Write a protein that binds this ligand. Structure first.
Ligand SMILES: C[C@@H](Oc1ccc(Cl)cc1)C(N)=O
Length: 460
């Protein structure tokens, strides 16, 4: 039975509005309703992994697992295995997988972050799950961010706190936050970004939604505009939105948006908004294709409609050779030529690099680079031809070209990372000097760039 080189992943996010679900929610898992929907001809074909994020979830873990498993079994006739379930307050993540994947899945981690201080600590934050699927690391974040049209900055702060403090994935990757720990990272939830138009335009917005004319609404979506200004979700992807705003509905119909200020809303307007979102970030040159992104039309217990997104995701096998794992393969080497980091920092310490990769026995520390002044004020750290030769565990090009090198640039004085990035080994050529490039982030904000050349030697 061969190991897969692709899997499909279902991502669901639903703010349940503290109400039990209706008896049938199969449309969610089938990617049926509005937007980019799944072909009818696929309905019996199970996804390999289903990741369900809920917010304002009133159910016990047991109650929700019984509804989810029984839903998937009715669709697929497959009894899914529970990989992980983690709840913070009313924020919940469930990971279900096909039984054939039980012995492909390992290194399961769960964590949560509570966002805010005093007043603002008590119901918002994130849950997450990570695991290995054969040679591929997968991370999943369900966040319920701060509500309110006038709190986009708070939401951006919630995002930074979650990506700094959520403890998922390989703890040996110590310089790296969750935005670098995974081959594929899916971040979804009630992100709570609103359509930023005047309150007096509510009925005009509703009109536009009834005509399925979303362009003038999406141009004011705070998540799209904040992302375009690099304020949040830097280096994440989102599929084009082609479904109506998923909030705020009158319960038990989808015919009415309930936007007017009420005591129950803290006297706040809730203009129709795309609160409920799925974004991802995969390592460079790994296959990931969104095959659905939409909302259900027939699940109306909440003031939110469920959102679905499905993905094809490239996966690799758990590679064994004569040599590695357990030793190096002298027929393999990674060389870095003419490398330099450009940092936005105003500081003057020496810097060194750390190279982290599952293709190495352990991370590699470089010598300190040479600081120069850039023409436009910047710090340029020159490594030249000084970077150490990396000794992969396996030289087979079928393995090595599928790998990635995480780079941290660290202060010699503090050993603190100033920037993290990632280089794909999926090169156009081996035994050939080729340009490489990564942006550098810290706490998920741009801090610089790393560029140079790579020369990859494999056994072929
Ligand atoms: C790894 C962990 O649990 C799993 C693994 C795979 C699946 Cl599909 C479900 C649960 C264990 N052996 O306890």
């Amino acid at each position: 039975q061969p190991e897969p080189d692709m899997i499909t992943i279902f991502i669901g996010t639903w703010n349940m509005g503290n109400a039990p679900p209706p008896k049938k929610i199969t449309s969610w898992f089938l990617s049926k309703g509005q937007g980019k929907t799944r072909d009818d001809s696929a309905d019996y074909i199970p996804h390999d992994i289903y990741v369900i994020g809920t917010q304002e979830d009133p159910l016990s873990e047991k109650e929700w697992l019984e509804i989810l498993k029984h839903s998937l079994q009715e669709i697929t006739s497959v009894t899914f295995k529970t990989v992980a379930i983690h709840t913070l307050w009313n924020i919940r993540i469930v990971v279900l997988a096909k039984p054939e994947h039980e012995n492909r899945i390992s290194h399961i981690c769960t964590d949560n972050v509570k966002t805010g201080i005093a007043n603002t600590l008590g119901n918002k934050g994130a849950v997450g799950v990570s695991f290995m699927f054969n040679g591929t690391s997968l991370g999943f974040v369900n966040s319920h961010l701060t509500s309110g049209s006038e709190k986009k900055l708070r939401r951006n702060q919630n995002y930074m706190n979650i990506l700094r403090f959520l403890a998922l994935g390989d703890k040996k990757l110590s310089p790296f936050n969750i935005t670098h720990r995974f081959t594929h990272l899916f971040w979804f939830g009630d992100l709570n970004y609103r359509v930023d138009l005047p309150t007096w335009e509510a009925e005009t917005i509703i009109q536009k939604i009834k005509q399925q004319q979303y362009a003038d609404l999406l141009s004011h979506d705070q998540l799209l505009t904040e992302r375009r200004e690099q304020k949040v979700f830097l280096h994440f992807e989102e599929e084009e939105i082609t479904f109506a705003p998923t909030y705020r509905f009158e319960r038990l119909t989808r015919d009415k948006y309930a936007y007017t200020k009420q005591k129950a809303t803290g006297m706040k307007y809730n203009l129709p908004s795309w609160c409920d979102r799925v974004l991802w970030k995969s390592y460079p040159l790994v296959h990931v294709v969104c095959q659905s992104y939409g909302s259900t039309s027939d699940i109306m217990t909440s003031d939110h409609s469920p959102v679905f997104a499905t993905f094809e995701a490239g996966v690799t096998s758990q590679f064994v050779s004569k040599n590695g794992p357990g030793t190096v393969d002298s027929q393999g080497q990674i060389e870095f030529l003419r490398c330099y980091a450009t940092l936005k920092t105003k500081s003057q310490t020496k810097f060194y690099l750390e190279f982290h990769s599952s293709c190495l026995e352990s991370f590699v520390k470089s010598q300190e680079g040479e600081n120069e002044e850039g023409s436009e004020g910047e710090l340029v750290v020159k490594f030249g031809e000084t970077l150490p030769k990396l000794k992969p565990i396996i030289s087979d090009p079928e393995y090595l070209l599928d790998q990635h090198i995480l780079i941290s640039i660290k202060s010699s004085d503090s050993d603190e990372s100033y920037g993290e990035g990632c280089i794909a080994l999926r090169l156009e050529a081996t035994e050939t000097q080729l340009p490489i490039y990564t942006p550098l982030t810290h706490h998920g904000e741009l801090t610089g760039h790393f560029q140079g050349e790579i020369k990859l030697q494999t056994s072929q």
